[PDB]
Amino acid sequence: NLTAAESRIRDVDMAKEMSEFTKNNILSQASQAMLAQANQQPQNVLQLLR
Amino acid sequence: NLTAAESRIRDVDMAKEMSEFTKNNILSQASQAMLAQANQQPQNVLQLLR
Amino acid sequence: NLTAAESRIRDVDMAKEMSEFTKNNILSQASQAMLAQANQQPQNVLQLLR
Amino acid sequence: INHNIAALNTLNRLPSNNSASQKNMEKLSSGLRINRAGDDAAGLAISEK
Amino acid sequence: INHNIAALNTLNRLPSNNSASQKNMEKLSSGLRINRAGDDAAGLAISEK
Amino acid sequence: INHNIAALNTLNRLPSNNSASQKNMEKLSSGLRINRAGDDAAGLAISEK
Amino acid sequence: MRGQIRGLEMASKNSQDGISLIQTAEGALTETHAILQRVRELVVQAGNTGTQDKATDLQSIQDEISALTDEIDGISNRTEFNGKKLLDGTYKVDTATPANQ
Amino acid sequence: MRGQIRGLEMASKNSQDGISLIQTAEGALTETHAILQRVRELVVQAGNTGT
Amino acid sequence: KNLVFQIGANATQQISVNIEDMGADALGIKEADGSIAALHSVNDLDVTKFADNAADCADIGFDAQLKVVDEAINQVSSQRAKLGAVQNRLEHTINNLSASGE
Amino acid sequence: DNAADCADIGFDAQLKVVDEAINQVSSQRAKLGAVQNRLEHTINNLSASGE
């Protein structure tokens, strides 16, 4: 029961933990796409009004 | 259900949200073309009647 | 027989239920493709007649 | 002609399609068509009694 | 006739168009319509509590 | 639409499903529905006396 | 002739406004219809499971039905195009007097 | 009309907030219910094993 | 304190809501009818009253008490019927809002 | 305190304050736009008859 308690201290919901690993990767890649596009916009600003 | 509610507070329709990201970029670039052409017109006014 | 009745209340045709899980995912992804393309069309409208 | 097109009914299908798939999920996980949701709270309440 | 024309309302649209696209960006990056900005600070504060 | 979906009630079922299987295990190992746990401490205490 | 095209173009605008109106009401009617399908399911469920389903959960069914009734009423009410309640089922009725439509 | 859609969209937000509320209470009631089932078992157990 | 929901783009186009259940609500005759009809749920007459009398009283003889449980189940069932009805209202609501809104 | 019944704090008149205010600025922009159109044909006449 002690190892069960300590387990609860150090439990992982590997389902959740992997799901948020996944999700945080999705959000990373998403934010990356947003930075690419953030670079794409002002390129257009200048080149369409240079 | 609490995280579902709060999710509804902070939901994004990434489909819509990207579609309007796209659209607002289109409208930006469009308006830009309109400013270029807005510069092109009076050039012609003067140079055709200078 | 009581648990059989109540089972009929709470039966799932996991075959059907998975088939419609699948199908609804297909219809989701399909509709998504339709939204991408819905964004692709007016891009072409403007850029081919900007 | 090109500024309100977003396939708006498609867009209304998409969260209903997702919603459907999450209902499907929800029953598959329990293995039970009985949901916490009171949709068919009659059949629910019946098997509850 | 040719010396104050710059399509001045277009020009006022352009940073509002860009502004719009940056709002869109901002939500897409977070994946969250909740912004740091207090626009809809009610809905914000609600999901904050 | 795609950033809080994790089938959260499924996820709540999973440790309750595992929990169930460990209760089952626990009784199978002892061969006894009597658990150390005081769930049904009445029936426990009865067969204890 | 250019009079005829001015009136034409405004009449095409009026036609399009037509299409969006008629499609507004139409889609609303398909939503009502989707209700009515669920309702029919709730008739074979208000079939009483023949007679197995007792008054308690008959009242639960009734809660769901009357709820959906308030929804259809909500369709016929909310559907206000330009403030004009299209699905007001009394608004364009050709009663004994046609002028009432 | 665009007034009508602004009020519409905020009312759909209010509807969704509705769904999450009603589902919050609902799921809580199903938990209560699960208790009550165990309770009924504890009535036939508080049946005193008869006596 | 009716938990109405604002739905119509017009004001007061609202959805009435009612919740009345709690742990101290069980077999609501009108309310608690004494130790029974709300308070077997609360106070739990299982101490010795049941061994004092198991059938004859019906107010400590298991009958009303199992009815406190059973109707409490029926209250939360009917409450989830109200709520589920409202959920369904929100389903077709948002379906109309998305359709007519579109 | 009250969301429907009063109509003077129950959302009805208030949304009507907004909605008609919208209709006032709409009708005001209808007056103004009418005047704009008057200035269109005005200057068109002034340039024509003036010519």
Author numbering:
A (entry chain d), B (entry chain T), C (entry chain f): 255 to 304
D (entry chain f), E (entry chain T), F (entry chain p): 3 to 51
G (entry chain A): 52 to 152
H (entry chain J): 52 to 102
I (entry chain J): 153 to 254
J (entry chain M): 204 to 254
The authors write:
There are three parts to the flagellar structure: the trans-membrane basal body that functions as the motor, the connecting rod and hook, and the flagellar filament that acts like a helical propeller. Our current understanding of supercoiling in bacterial flagellar filaments, referred to as polymorphic switching, is based upon the notion that protofilaments within the flagellar filament can exist in two discrete states, that differ slightly in length. The “short” state results from a protofilament having a right-handed inclination (the R-state), while the “long” state results from a protofilament having a left-handed inclination (the L-state). To reconstruct filaments at high resolution, all protofilaments must be “locked” into the same state, either L- or R-type, producing straightened filaments that lead to non-motile bacteria.
The L-type 11-start helices are tilted left by ~ 1.7° and the R-type 11-start helices are tilted right by ~ 3.9°. Strikingly, we found those sites are not necessarily conserved among different species or participate in unique inter-subunit interactions. We also identified several straight mutations that are only involved in the 11-start interactions: S17P, H84R and A39V in the double mutants. We also detected two mutations, S17P and S285P, located in the middle of the small coiled-coil D0 domain. These two residues are not conserved in other species, and proline is not found at this position in any wildtype species. Therefore, mutation S17P or S285P in B. subtilis forces a local bend of ~ 30° in the helix axis, and this conformational change makes the D0 coiled-coil adopt an L-type form more easily.
